[PDB]
Write an enzyme that holds these catalytic residues in place. Structure first.
Site, PDB file in Angstrom:
ATOM      1  N   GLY H 134     -44.473   1.774  74.795  1.00  0.00           N
ATOM      2  CA  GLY H 134     -45.458   1.839  73.735  1.00  0.00           C
ATOM      3  C   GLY H 134     -45.136   2.878  72.682  1.00  0.00           C
ATOM      4  N   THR H 169     -39.574  -3.403  84.405  1.00  0.00           N
ATOM      5  CA  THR H 169     -40.474  -2.360  84.877  1.00  0.00           C
ATOM      6  C   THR H 169     -41.796  -2.365  84.119  1.00  0.00           C
ATOM      7  OG1 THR H 169     -39.503  -0.722  83.391  1.00  0.00           O
ATOM      8  CG2 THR H 169     -38.522  -0.954  85.581  1.00  0.00           C
ATOM      9  N   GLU H 244     -19.283   2.873  57.199  1.00  0.00           N
ATOM     10  CA  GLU H 244     -18.366   1.742  57.281  1.00  0.00           C
ATOM     11  C   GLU H 244     -18.986   0.545  57.992  1.00  0.00           C
ATOM     12  OE1 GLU H 244     -15.373   1.422  55.943  1.00  0.00           O
ATOM     13  OE2 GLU H 244     -15.455   3.415  55.022  1.00  0.00           O
TER      14      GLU H 244
HETATM   15  N1  LIG Z   1     -31.649   3.127  80.006  1.00  0.00           N
HETATM   16  C1  LIG Z   1     -32.776   3.802  80.205  1.00  0.00           C
HETATM   17  N2  LIG Z   1     -33.991   3.198  79.962  1.00  0.00           N
HETATM   18  C2  LIG Z   1     -35.142   3.878  80.166  1.00  0.00           C
HETATM   19  C3  LIG Z   1     -35.108   5.187  80.616  1.00  0.00           C
HETATM   20  N3  LIG Z   1     -36.379   5.623  80.729  1.00  0.00           N
HETATM   21  C4  LIG Z   1     -37.213   4.628  80.358  1.00  0.00           C
HETATM   22  N4  LIG Z   1     -36.462   3.537  80.014  1.00  0.00           N
HETATM   23  C5  LIG Z   1     -36.979   2.244  79.538  1.00  0.00           C
HETATM   24  O1  LIG Z   1     -38.240   2.434  78.925  1.00  0.00           O
HETATM   25  C6  LIG Z   1     -39.131   1.402  79.290  1.00  0.00           C
HETATM   26  C7  LIG Z   1     -40.568   1.913  79.344  1.00  0.00           C
HETATM   27  O2  LIG Z   1     -40.866   2.717  78.223  1.00  0.00           O
HETATM   28  P1  LIG Z   1     -40.662   4.307  78.315  1.00  0.00           P
HETATM   29  O3  LIG Z   1     -39.574   4.750  77.371  1.00  0.00           O
HETATM   30  O4  LIG Z   1     -40.328   4.683  79.737  1.00  0.00           O
HETATM   31  O5  LIG Z   1     -42.071   4.961  77.903  1.00  0.00           O
HETATM   32  P2  LIG Z   1     -42.636   4.804  76.409  1.00  0.00           P
HETATM   33  O6  LIG Z   1     -41.610   4.137  75.527  1.00  0.00           O
HETATM   34  O7  LIG Z   1     -42.987   6.168  75.872  1.00  0.00           O
HETATM   35  O8  LIG Z   1     -43.957   3.893  76.542  1.00  0.00           O
HETATM   36  P3  LIG Z   1     -45.321   4.441  77.203  1.00  0.00           P
HETATM   37  O9  LIG Z   1     -45.407   3.989  78.642  1.00  0.00           O
HETATM   38  O10 LIG Z   1     -46.491   3.876  76.436  1.00  0.00           O
HETATM   39  O11 LIG Z   1     -45.378   5.947  77.124  1.00  0.00           O
HETATM   40  C8  LIG Z   1     -38.654   0.907  80.642  1.00  0.00           C
HETATM   41  O12 LIG Z   1     -38.770  -0.492  80.725  1.00  0.00           O
HETATM   42  C9  LIG Z   1     -37.197   1.309  80.714  1.00  0.00           C
HETATM   43  O13 LIG Z   1     -36.378   0.174  80.581  1.00  0.00           O
HETATM   44  C10 LIG Z   1     -33.890   5.798  80.862  1.00  0.00           C
HETATM   45  O14 LIG Z   1     -33.851   6.957  81.265  1.00  0.00           O
HETATM   46  N5  LIG Z   1     -32.722   5.102  80.656  1.00  0.00           N
HETATM   47  N1  LIG Z   2       1.238   3.181  55.960  1.00  0.00           N
HETATM   48  C1  LIG Z   2       0.008   3.723  56.117  1.00  0.00           C
HETATM   49  N2  LIG Z   2      -1.076   2.949  55.865  1.00  0.00           N
HETATM   50  C2  LIG Z   2      -2.327   3.441  56.006  1.00  0.00           C
HETATM   51  C3  LIG Z   2      -2.494   4.834  56.438  1.00  0.00           C
HETATM   52  N3  LIG Z   2      -3.816   5.064  56.497  1.00  0.00           N
HETATM   53  C4  LIG Z   2      -4.444   3.918  56.134  1.00  0.00           C
HETATM   54  N4  LIG Z   2      -3.555   2.953  55.843  1.00  0.00           N
HETATM   55  C5  LIG Z   2      -3.886   1.577  55.408  1.00  0.00           C
HETATM   56  O1  LIG Z   2      -5.055   1.608  54.590  1.00  0.00           O
HETATM   57  C6  LIG Z   2      -5.967   0.576  54.962  1.00  0.00           C
HETATM   58  C7  LIG Z   2      -7.356   1.183  55.056  1.00  0.00           C
HETATM   59  O2  LIG Z   2      -7.637   1.823  53.817  1.00  0.00           O
HETATM   60  P1  LIG Z   2      -8.795   2.930  53.716  1.00  0.00           P
HETATM   61  O3  LIG Z   2      -8.329   4.239  54.303  1.00  0.00           O
HETATM   62  O4  LIG Z   2     -10.051   2.450  54.401  1.00  0.00           O
HETATM   63  O5  LIG Z   2      -9.013   3.067  52.131  1.00  0.00           O
HETATM   64  P2  LIG Z   2     -10.236   3.928  51.546  1.00  0.00           P
HETATM   65  O6  LIG Z   2     -11.508   3.573  52.276  1.00  0.00           O
HETATM   66  O7  LIG Z   2     -10.391   3.614  50.079  1.00  0.00           O
HETATM   67  O8  LIG Z   2      -9.940   5.396  51.729  1.00  0.00           O
HETATM   68  C8  LIG Z   2      -5.512   0.023  56.299  1.00  0.00           C
HETATM   69  O9  LIG Z   2      -5.302  -1.386  56.193  1.00  0.00           O
HETATM   70  C9  LIG Z   2      -4.202   0.711  56.614  1.00  0.00           C
HETATM   71  O10 LIG Z   2      -3.172  -0.264  56.798  1.00  0.00           O
HETATM   72  C10 LIG Z   2      -1.263   5.614  56.693  1.00  0.00           C
HETATM   73  O11 LIG Z   2      -1.323   6.805  57.064  1.00  0.00           O
HETATM   74  N5  LIG Z   2      -0.085   5.004  56.514  1.00  0.00           N
END
Ligand SMILES: Nc1nc2c(ncn2[C@@H]2O[C@H](COP(=O)(O)OP(=O)(O)OP(=O)(O)O)[C@@H](O)[C@H]2O)c(=O)[nH]1
Ligand SMILES: Nc1nc2c(ncn2[C@@H]2O[C@H](COP(=O)(O)OP(=O)(O)O)[C@@H](O)[C@H]2O)c(=O)[nH]1
Ligand SMILES: Nc1nc2c(ncn2[C@@H]2O[C@H](COP(=O)(O)OP(=O)(O)OP(=O)(O)O)[C@@H](O)[C@H]2O)c(=O)[nH]1
Ligand SMILES: Nc1nc2c(ncn2[C@@H]2O[C@H](COP(=O)(O)OP(=O)(O)O)[C@@H](O)[C@H]2O)c(=O)[nH]1
Ligand SMILES: [Mg+2]
Ligand SMILES: [Mg+2]
EC number: 3.6.5.-
Lengths: 427, 68, 426, 43, 40, 52, 426, 427
Positions: H134, H169, H244
């Site tokens: 909740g 749960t 990204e």
């Molecule tokens: N993966 C993971 N899920 C959790 C954990 N604790 C609670 N949950 C999930 O949370 C759901 C229940 O809601 P909670 O987060 O426990 O409590 P809440 O969201 O504050 O809701 P209220 O009961 O109204 O207070 C359960 O169905 C669990 O799946 C956790 O530690 N790990």
């Molecule tokens: N040869 C080479 N190519 C690179 C290198 N770093 C990135 N690239 C190329 O650049 C592309 C990604 O570009 P990007 O870094 O995201 O460009 P920007 O986001 O404008 O900075 C990829 O397809 C790579 O092949 C490098 O150190 N050497």
């Protein structure tokens, strides 16, 4: 030049247990996982000082997988590579192919994809399974189907363990073997049969172990695989890759079933007694008493043959032995193939494992040949599938877990068509 | 998405060379319609200006066809 | 001056070329490091035919290593004299053909031949007056026969004037390394009969026979066989590389050996080859060289010369020798065996002399005989090819890759008509 | 003789480790000021 | 549990100089043919 | 002389690259040691709950 | 005497300029702290082109670093050779471009262009005989493409007769570093074809291809690519800075390379670039330089030059050499490739020689090729632009900032009829 | 440059506690507030040797805020920054949006204004909240509305936690989520979904933590935010700022919902077993099971992707990995963009916390992508909101607090319009 191996079932991963011990001993990798680049085709080197194998053990019974997890090679294997389920298929092709296979094959494929992605020079996949069981039959076939549809043309080398003619452990293994071979026809590139009574006979006769177990059988299988990948691993006078067997042993797209044999298999005393030369090892590799499959080519025609030589072997005498074998008419070849031989040579002799039963030798031979006694084997299997199928025994299981009668009929008629295939080809 | 020919680098951009090892994506390379028809080819020149087949905020107009 | 580039295809090609380059590097006196350390100045004057000077007496071979699998290249590179090959000339695939002519000529070729052609074009334009190409391969493999064959076709299309040698290791029936040997060999010969300029037919069974009977060796390894082949090649190019009394280059040999354009398949020998104990018991004379050069149990192919007629013959001699004795021996041999030489060509023999013998030897000779007894081998391969093709065995591995049956039929037709023309000229 | 500044002349160290550190210094900034600000470049 | 190496090269004792313009390399002071007195 | 100068530069670069490779190996060993020393499973804020 | 004013735009421009200034400082022998320590006074003779003497041998670069975020400038200054740049030349932006051509060209430019123009005018009128401006930037980013473009427009409006060089790095589909690459590149080139005098097109695809096929490096960080580009532009401007047998300045190169006013997009290459494992196997001769120069594998554009015809070419050589070898290599390479050179322009190649090679090198070369193959990359950008613009993808970020879609339409039309005229002239 | 973070609700301020612990550990700031200038984007320096975080934790229940007030970070946070109410919204969006939000938002906005005119190069705002509650929903939306009307053009990133599909749960969380999204549509510029069940699956699978608590979830959320904002603090080869993502990640003004993933999330044992390089971490980023939102990108089509790389990363291998991803047929993009990738590289490797679960790694990747799987999530949420609103359940609470059914109807129609927008845009 990396080849990856996948082990499906209780038999498959025990064969893997033997094979990976052999590979670690060959490449000098301690069981903890680091040596104190030939390894690169089996193990991948992670970071610094650790090699992890390129394999997955996938199975449904957890007992043997946890045996592996708590054995000696605890740290060698990556934890994710060891895939284990919770319940078996229980010798049920339908159960392992439709019910649990559809849940486990997805993770199996997900890990295989990562292994292949890490691979660079992938030679192919190779699968280890026994068709008599439920897991390795059902989800083994499913995994092969999906791997083939995902990769297409990569070499899938299947080292299958078919049931023995007379020695048996189950009752539904005819059903399982037929239903597995039906899907193995269209997807496996190269398939090699391995019966258990043949290896039992080899151990009893040549290795003179009067009470052998599955450990010795797996050791011999690992020796065969090591001999078959030695060309990739080490350099030789005439090296061979895995791809050449497809092209040189499979004349027709459905005829891929080959008899593996190995020689010599001798004890530490017979090694002292007799010398081993290329001529006699080639002659002995053609005997029915040293084959890994319980069938006799005396009634068959050698469609093709591949000879792999390891150790102190030169090309002249292997040429001489092959020439004498061809000139003599004791064995006969199909007349549509006068060029029925393929030779390969590698330098490294086979290694010996401490606690093993084989003595170290100068030279060794592995034969992979293709003939029609396999066509005899398929009809012999169809006999005992037919007997039980006449009264619809055990079929209520498969129907309950999700098959139907159409699949049984189509598999049986596919095996009959394969019989006619072999009969016509051998003419 | 489509993969345009590089004309200098496609030999190194072959799928097997990138350790793919499965059957590659051919749709991205066939929807481009090169002059040769393979990945080694030249594009077709274009002329004129492109009209707005879409309405605002990414809604296709009634006249233009689409997959259902 | 006159330039020969080397192209090695497949494992057989790579190993033979490795031994060949070891032999040639020793002959020109360059160390396995690659620097020159020779004694006479005759070695410098003609190194450009095979090598290129880099920096301060450093010479690299003019060779192109080519296959589809890393293993053979790694084996060649690990060994001695493996440090002289320039890494830029390792044109190199990653998958592997697998004795598949279709794979090595239609699929992997289409993606490797661009780099192969770029390398060979660079290496052929670097030199000033190219003499020709020399290719070494075997006709049984896929990456050796298919890839090398496609390269031969493209090279002949590009440079249609320069010379072309093809040292081809053909199969023989007794030991057949691959089950698809005739399927590969028939197609390779189909392309060779129309693209290659001259071909030297080598045979492993003949090499085994030489090393068994003649050399009386116990373990005649592939190293020894490849050394024999390398000696043959070096004896072929010796006249180009060294001064002689009667010079003879590759084009001169081709024009004096080939009477009709489709008959360019030669059978080759080498002398002297003496056993390890019988070396001291023999003399070193021109008659002693020729009476073994003309021997049937010395040629390097499974073709008996006395089953047919010598169309033409060529003898390249090395050593301080006498032209009177050379010519007298040639005339005497031709006259004694008057029935094995074709009637309508007097003096079927071309002979040449060079004054630099191979290292450690006083005198040597090499023989190139264009005879009509090679149609025996051609018919023998054709029968196996027809035997499998009539029933369509092993055919899907070729068909499902792009090839059609018309290629096989046309290759059969060309092989058959070449057999027929050799027969009519016999 | 110093190693020249040419494209192929550089060693390959791991990018993650550096003795100086990878903190990005705020040597170039703006003064808060007002709707018009001032660029500042500090040594 | 149960390779060729080469020594590094040394810089040449005669260091090469890149600052050799063609003009300064080909135009240096030169003398020749001293004048000869006339005969009588 | 120019060729020899280039060879000297290349040899120096190779030696420095070998040193850099040794640094890389040391770095990998160091991070593995840190993982085995402080990152082990039985050192967590939930090890009491997830204890075997 | 003649003056080049440097401008760096965006992240890529800033890093490229930093590497360029480090290379030039090393070449002229000025240490990172800013004092002259050269050996021969040939360097002191032409330092006014890039530097101004401040106080007792204190030389500062004639460069302006400009962008919309000081994030890159902070690292540039923190790195080595950071104290050489004068603090006043930096230009700051607090909002950031956010990869928006609109943000870089209409909103932030409107308030930062006054400061950058004041700095540029002061720096350009500080010297007496200006030669031109040299701007390095990108075509995909926001503050490098747009703001630098508007700077180009303003500078052309103020000083129309002085020369202008624009090193622009262009995007490629395979290296998709950003999503609005076509939108930025199309409009950037639309402005460049009407404002810039000559543009050097660069791309990371060709940079990687070079550093893995020629250099064969393992981990080529952006430093290596920036070093390549820096060495290229240094070779471009070496003629201004050192005496040569046949001088060629910026205007001379432009008039010899530009046949028509709209044909000012060139592809560039540098040589020699050899691996450290092959520097022992190769030599350093003019034929070796020319062979690598004319290889398409050494080009620095995503366009194979042999897809079209070379309109003009230029080769700037550095080092002591022979003009006979230079011009015979030019004539030979022009005559051997009779299909890749236009027919109605004889002697397509213009060559120039300088006597001062870069430090550590005996001989070097630089290539500028005005070919018709750049229309391939122009088409590959234009089709992407049309595909995105047909369905208004990401168009609102540009529309809501002020510009009309007529901008996109006119840029498309200009780029389309430009590629049409390239096709006509091919 | 400065960017400030505001936290709303029980989830918001707890993830803020974890994130600020990570920030202090990253910048080497003691819990007292002084080091033993990259901190300038998060900590303002007061006097001599004192760093005050640029954040506000605002909530209604005093318990959780007083927990922070009496926690170990007493001296780190300025007392006035910790805004706290007196009574809760009690899982009532309407109660928190009209009855207490109207009383707390003025003070919250005053504090935000003070932080904003204290900072100079303000990059933007980033909000943490869970829409299922909740307080985080109602007054959070009100505060975002007032922030939009006060600043407008400045970036306002949101890291919002939507309710899980099946794991829940609360009961009225569909109402709260729908009513919060109806106002979030035209005020939040970029929103990132975070699902507790997806994070639970990630921790179970990769971090092998069988019974994790909310602290692990908060720790990895802190890792994600630090990884995506580290370019402002640490120099890199290819840096990137907050602005990204607005341009390169939102194709249309009302399609702003981003799926986030991070790799490697690997324990210390699997880290020792497996090598971590650019290729496999990039593959794991795109792997569907490693997405921190419970959905599947395979069911939809990608619109754009943003890849942040930290640590030992060169540009060539990330470019090659991007090319391999492009050429792989497993995933496909929309037919618009041939360039749908945005890469960024930073030198600083991610830091580690004592007692945490993430092992120290050389490199890391954070992917933020856009697809129609967001549309699938919205459809699933809409179905179960419809189920409840059909029978007028729980409506009397909102009617009694002060809203009316017009808001419900207009929110439902707006969400339906959103579904239509996704369907048409993905064509
Ligand atoms: N993966 C993971 N899920 C959790 C954990 N604790 C609670 N949950 C999930 O949370 C759901 C229940 O809601 P909670 O987060 O426990 O409590 P809440 O969201 O504050 O809701 P209220 O009961 O109204 O207070 C359960 O169905 C669990 O799946 C956790 O530690 N790990
Ligand atoms: N040869 C080479 N190519 C690179 C290198 N770093 C990135 N690239 C190329 O650049 C592309 C990604 O570009 P990007 O870094 O995201 O460009 P920007 O986001 O404008 O900075 C990829 O397809 C790579 O092949 C490098 O150190 N050497
Ligand atoms: N050669 C050989 N065969 C084995 C070995 N272990 C099991 N098998 C064979 O495997 C067959 C049954 O399959 P298993 O591997 O035992 O078990 P499974 O394949 O997982 O089938 P399920 O029991 O239904 O799960 C038996 O008929 C055995 O002959 C072994 O170590 N060596
Ligand atoms: N003389 C010689 N022959 C070889 C050698 N290696 C292989 N061969 C012959 O080459 C034939 C098979 O070559 P192959 O393996 O198919 O070559 P590939 O094309 O690379 O696969 C065999 O019949 C061998 O006799 C060698 O080193 N020397
Ligand atoms: Mg079982
Ligand atoms: Mg609450």
């Amino acid at each position: 030049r990396e080849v990856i191996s996948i082990h499906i079932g209780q038999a498959g991963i025990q064969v893997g247990n033997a094979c990976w011990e052999l590979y670690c001993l060959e490449h000098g990798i301690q069981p903890d996982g680091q040596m104190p680049d030939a390894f690169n085709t089996f193990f991948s080197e992670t970071g610094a000082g650790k090699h992890v194998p390129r394999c997955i053990f996938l199975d449904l019974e957890p007992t043997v997988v946890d045996e592996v997890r708590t054995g000696t090679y605890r740290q060698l294997f990556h934890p994710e590579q060891l895939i284990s389920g919770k319940e078996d298929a229980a010798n049920n092709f339908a159960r392992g192919h439709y019910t649990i296979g559809k849940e486990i094959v997805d993770l199996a494929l997900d890990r295989i994809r990562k292994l292949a992605d890490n691979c660079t020079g992938l030679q192919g996949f190779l699968v280890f399974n026994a068709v008599g069981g439920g897991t390795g039959s059902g989800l083994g076939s499913l995994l092969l189907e999906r791997l083939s549809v995902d990769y297409g043309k990569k070499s899938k080398l299947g080292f299958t363990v078919y049931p023995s003619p007379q020695v048996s452990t189950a009752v539904v293994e005819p059903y399982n073997s037929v239903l597995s071979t039906h899907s193995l026809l269209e997807h496996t590139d190269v398939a090699v049969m391995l019966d258990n009574e043949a290896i039992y006979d080899i151990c009893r006769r040549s290795l003179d172990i009067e009470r052998p177990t599955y450990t010795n059988l797996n050791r011999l299988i690992a020796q065969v695989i090591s001999s078959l990948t030695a060309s990739l691993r080490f350099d030789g006078a005439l090296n061979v890759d895995i791809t050449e067997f497809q092209t040189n042993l499979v004349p027709y797209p459905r005829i891929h079933f080959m008899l593996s044999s190995y020689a010599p298999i001798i004890s530490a005393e017979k090694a002292y007694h007799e010398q081993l030369s290329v001529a006699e090892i080639t002659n002995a590799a053609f005997e029915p008493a040293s084959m890994m499959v319980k069938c006799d080519p005396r009634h068959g025609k050698y469609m093709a043959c591949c000879l792999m030589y390891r150790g102190d072997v030169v090309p002249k005498d292997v040429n001489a032995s092959v020439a004498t074998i061809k000139t003599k008419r004791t064995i006969q070849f199909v007349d549509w193939c006068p060029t029925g031989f393929k030779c390969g040579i590698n330098y490294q002799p086979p290694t010996v494992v401490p606690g093993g039963d084989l003595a170290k030798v100068q030279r060794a031979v592995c034969m992979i040949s293709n003939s029609t006694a396999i066509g005899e084997i398929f009809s012999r299997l169809d006999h005992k599938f037919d007997l039980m199928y006449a009264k619809r025994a055990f079929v209520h299981w498969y129907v309950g877990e999700g098959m139907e009668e159409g699949e049984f009929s189509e598999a049986r008629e596919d095996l009959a068509a394969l019989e006619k295939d072999f009969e016509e080809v051998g003419a | 998405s489509r993969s345009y020919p590089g004309e200098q680098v496609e030999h190194a951009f072959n799928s097997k060379r990138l350790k793919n090892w499965e059957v590659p994506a051919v749709d991205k390379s066939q929807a481009i319609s090169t002059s040769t028809g393979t990945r080694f080819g030249t594009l077709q020149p274009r002329s004129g200006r492109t009209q707005f087949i879409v309405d605002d905020n990414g809604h296709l107009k009634s006249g233009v066809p689409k997959l259902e | 001056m006159r330039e020969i580039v080397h192209i090695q295809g497949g494992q057989c090609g790579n190993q033979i070329g490795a031994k060949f380059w070891e032999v040639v590097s020793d002959e020109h006196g360059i160390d396995p490091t690659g620097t020159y350390h020779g004694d006479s100045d005759l070695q410098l004057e003609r190194i450009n035919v095979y090598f290129n000077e880099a920096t301060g007496g450093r010479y690299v071979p003019r060779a192109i290593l080519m296959d589809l699998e890393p293993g053979t290249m790694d084996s060649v590179r690990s060994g001695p004299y493996g440090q002289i090959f320039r890494p830029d000339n390792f044109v190199f695939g990653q998958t592997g053909a697998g004795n598949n002519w279709a794979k090595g000529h239609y699929t992997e070729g289409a993606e490797l031949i661009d780099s192969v052609l770029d390398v060979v074009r660079k290496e052929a334009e670097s030199c000033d007056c190219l003499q020709g190409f020399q290719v070494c391969h075997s006709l049984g493999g896929g990456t050796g026969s298919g890839m090398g064959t496609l390269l031969i076709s493209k090279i002949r299309e590009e440079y249609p004037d320069r010379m072309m040698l093809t040292f081809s290791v053909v199969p023989s029936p007794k030991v057949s390394d691959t089950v698809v040997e005739p399927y590969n060999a028939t197609l390779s010969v189909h392309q060779l009969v129309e693209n290659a300029d001259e071909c030297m037919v080598l045979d492993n069974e003949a090499l085994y026979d030489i090393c068994f009977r003649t050399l009386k060796l116990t373990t005649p390894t592939f190293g020894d066989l490849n050394h024999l082949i390398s000696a043959v090649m070096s004896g072929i190019t010796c006249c180009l590389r060294f001064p002689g009394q009667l010079n003879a280059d590759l084009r001169k040999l081709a024009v004096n050996l080939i009477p009709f354009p489709r008959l360019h398949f030669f059978m080759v020998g080498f002398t002297p080859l003496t056993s390890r104990g019988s070396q001291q018991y023999r003399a070193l004379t021109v008659p002693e060289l020729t009476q073994q050069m003309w021997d049937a149990k010395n040629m390097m192919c499974a073709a008996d010369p006395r089953h047919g007629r010598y169309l033409t013959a060529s003898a390249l001699f090395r050593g301080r020798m006498s032209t009177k004795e050379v010519d007298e021996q040639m005339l005497n041999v031709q006259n004694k065996n008057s029935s094995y030489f074709v009637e309508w060509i007097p003096n079927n023999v071309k002979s040449s002399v060079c004054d630099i013998p191979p290292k450690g030897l006083k005198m040597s000779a090499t023989f190139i005989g264009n005879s009509t007894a090679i149609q025996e081998m051609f018919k023998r391969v054709s029968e196996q090819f027809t035997a499998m093709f009539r029933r369509k065995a092993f055919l899907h591995w070729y068909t499902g890759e792009g090839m059609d049956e018309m290629e096989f039929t046309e290759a059969e037709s060309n092989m058959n008509d070449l057999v027929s023309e050799y027969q009519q000229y016999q | 003789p110093p190693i020249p500044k040419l494209p192929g002349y550089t060693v390959c160290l791991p990018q993650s480790l550096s003795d100086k550190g990878f903190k990005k210094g705020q040597t170039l900034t703006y003064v808060n000021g007002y709707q018009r600000e001032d660029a500042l470049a500090q040594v | 549990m149960a390779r060729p190496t080469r020594n590094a090269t040394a810089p040449p004792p005669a260091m090469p100089s890149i600052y050799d313009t063609t003009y300064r390399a080909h135009y240096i002071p030169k003398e020749g043919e001293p004048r000869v007195g006339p005969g009588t | 002389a120019f060729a020899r100068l280039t060879a000297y530069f290349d040899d120096q670069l190779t030696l420095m690259q070998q040193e850099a490779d040794q640094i890389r190996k040391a770095y990998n060993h160091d991070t593995e040691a840190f993982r085995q020393q402080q990152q082990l499973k039985h050192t967590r804020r939930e090890w009491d709950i997830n204890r075997p």
